[PDB]
């Protein structure tokens, strides 16, 4: 019974909503589901490593890799990809990145793993150039080669960038789709720039403890999260802000 229950820590939206949609499909396979939502991204891998949950559903592989680099006690594994959230830039004050003035302030999130993801959007917009000798996924602010608009950067918790946006604390603000939707923003209608879906390594995953990735429970969960019902749910409910991907 408890051996048939899957406890998962997930961010509120879309991840806990996708799990709630998957619940009756898991019962059809013989498994129950318990979902825990936590207050910030740093809590989810800790809960898993502490054995309070069986799995978490909140991050991408670069985030997971960074977390394990920082905490050698985390012996975690990717059980499989589910969905992609193309990253957004938001502004109350400018309509596009081409319109930002010299000295403009860019509010980055403080997510170490996503520093290259953010900067790559600015490089693709033609605002900065990054050192070509560094992989984009590994790029930081130290890797900026050219900055002809002399952009200045600030860092806010990913949980609070929706507030930096509403407060007009900078000229342009990065918000992860999960926290954008959690704040009642619609990323495809409200963002001023959206990340390309091409060549994108930031699919969100199910993570488990090492040695648990082929367990019956986790295979059952991966199965439901790749069903036609769950892919169609994702596609309809989030209006293209969230996209199902292969495992
Ligand atoms: C904790 S890594 C960020 C995850 C977030 N759901 C995104 O894909 O942008």
Curated annotation (Swiss-Prot):
Stored Pfam families: Lipoprotein_9
One cellular component term from this protein's GO annotations in UniProt: plasma membrane
SUPFAM superfamilies hit by this protein: Periplasmic binding protein-like II (SSF53850)
Keyword list, A-Z: Amino-acid transport, Cell membrane, Lipoprotein, Membrane, Palmitate, Signal, Transport
Subunit record text: The complex is composed of two ATP-binding proteins (MetN), two transmembrane proteins (MetP) and a solute-binding protein (metQ).
Role description: Part of the ABC transporter complex MetNPQ involved in methionine import. Binds the methionine and transfers it to the membrane-bound permease. It has also been shown to be involved in methionine sulfoxide transport.
Protein name as catalogued: Methionine-binding lipoprotein MetQ
Source organism: Bacillus subtilis (strain 168)
Gene: metQ
